[PDB]
Amino acid sequence: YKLICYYTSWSQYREGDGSCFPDAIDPFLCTHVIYSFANISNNEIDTWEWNDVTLYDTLNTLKNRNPNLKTLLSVGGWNYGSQRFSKIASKTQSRRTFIKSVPPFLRTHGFDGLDLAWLWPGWRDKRHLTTLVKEMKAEFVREAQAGTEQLLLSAAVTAGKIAIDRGYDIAQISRHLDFISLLTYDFHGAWRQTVGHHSPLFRGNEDASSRFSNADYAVSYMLRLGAPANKLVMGIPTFGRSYTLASSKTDVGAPISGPGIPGRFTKWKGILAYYEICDFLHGATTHRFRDQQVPYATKGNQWVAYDDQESVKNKARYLKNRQLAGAMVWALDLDDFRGTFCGQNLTFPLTSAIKDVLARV
Ligand SMILES: CC(=O)N[C@@H]1[C@@H](O)[C@H](O[C@@H]2O[C@H](CO)[C@@H](O[C@@H]3O[C@H](CO)[C@@H](O[C@@H]4O[C@H](CO)[C@@H](O)[C@H](O)[C@H]4NC(C)=O)[C@H](O)[C@H]3NC(C)=O)[C@H](O)[C@H]2NC(C)=O)[C@@H](CO)O[C@@H]1O
Numbered sequence: 001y002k003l004i005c006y007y008t009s010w011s012q013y014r015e016g017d018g019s020c021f022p023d024a025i026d027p028f029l030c031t032h033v034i035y036s037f038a039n040i041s042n043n044e045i046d047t048w049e050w051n052d053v054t055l056y057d058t059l060n061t062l063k064n065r066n067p068n069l070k071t072l073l074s075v076g077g078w079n080y081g082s083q084r085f086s087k088i089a090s091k092t093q094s095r096r097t098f099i100k101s102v103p104p105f106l107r108t109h110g111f112d113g114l115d116l117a118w119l120w121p122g123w124r125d126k127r128h129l130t131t132l133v134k135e136m137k138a139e140f141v142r143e144a145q146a147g148t149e150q151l152l153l154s155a156a157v158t159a160g161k162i163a164i165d166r167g168y169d170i171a172q173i174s175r176h177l178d179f180i181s182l183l184t185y186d187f188h189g190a191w192r193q194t195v196g197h198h199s200p201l202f203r204g205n206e207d208a209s210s211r212f213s214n215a216d217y218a219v220s221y222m223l224r225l226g227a228p229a230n231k232l233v234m235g236i237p238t239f240g241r242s243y244t245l246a247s248s249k250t251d252v253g254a255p256i257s258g259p260g261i262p263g264r265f266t267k268w269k270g271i272l273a274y275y276e277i278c279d280f281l282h283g284a285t286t287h288r289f290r291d292q293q294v295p296y297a298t299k300g301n302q303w304v305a306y307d308d309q310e311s312v313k314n315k316a317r318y319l320k321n322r323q324l325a326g327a328m329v330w331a332l333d334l335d336d337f338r339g340t341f342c343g344q345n346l347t348f349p350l351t352s353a354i355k356d357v358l359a360r361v
């Protein structure tokens, strides 16, 4: 069973206890840790922050304690133009230059693979993602001839049906990637003027226009499209999405005024870390969608949709019963990594809980 965990760069800036460094990462926790995100410059893979070389270095020392742990660097990300990627991929002289530069860079900084996080290809780009993936793997294969262990190649694939059809040739890219992580955590958002969960596990016979907006459907669609189970990985979020209520309506369907106020430590409209959530839960109203199997809480005029140990364990049995390759978690630095905000003295509660299901029968 694979356990892919993302660590984000910008998480070093968070203040106080919010601060997170590859340091904090427990080396036996995951099977793969992915550094997010690399930049592209002069058509070549390159660092993003000033001190990335240091952090890459810190993160790859974990391998001293755990020789079986693999690490990957992710290119792309949301704060990276889709457009920029699209430009490098359609012109063969630029794509090749991008391609040729990756093995050397990864080898220098001691990564084991590259993660493609192109969010998201347009309908005109599908043909080009496919070429990118194909040529990239071909280069990785050619580089192994030099007697090194072949680099891994993976991709982050969004989970809304429409998004998938528009830009991903699932049948084609799966033969070339080592694993695909499904971002099953973005099914709702402030962009819809009502309250709703972003990572429901099942459809829940409540509403029926968006029957394609849950992990279960996404996982089946990918399977029908030709991705083998032994390569699909289900994404499980460790943050929650917040919303400012526009009324006193707190139940399903309730109206919204916009995203929720920022967290003391993550400072971002509409997002909360699990550790900020554990604090929020005091004097909050506990609620849970029984059909969909995920919780939400509300207090004053704030309404938060999130995941806890029960939900995340539930998601893990799902992937086990469908025989998927494993689980991916976004992201380690949003979990209770110090282990001192969520009561019980356990660090990485959400992630350990997933591991526990994965590690048994
Ligand atoms: C659920 C989840 O995890 N969501 C994530 C989402 O949060 C990610 O996005 C990011 O948004 C925040 C703002 O909301 C960005 O933070 C800044 O990061 C930059 C560095 O790139 C910092 O600049 C530094 O500030 C210090 C001063 O303290 C200086 O010393 C530095 O030199 C300066 N950098 C320079 C010189 O330019 C800045 O301080 C950070 N401040 C914040 C807002 O905390 C963050 O960059 C941004 N991520 C990206 C890649 O843009 C998103 C990532 O793509 O994924 C999610 O959806």
Ligand SMILES: *[C@@H]1O[C@H](CO)[C@@H](O)[C@H](O)[C@H]1NC(C)=O
Residues within 6 Å of the ligand: 039, 040, 041, 042, 047, 048, 049
């Ligand atoms: C990333 O690369 C682009 C392309 O050169 C460059 O424009 C930018 O300065 C880099 N971004 C950051 C913040 O490092």
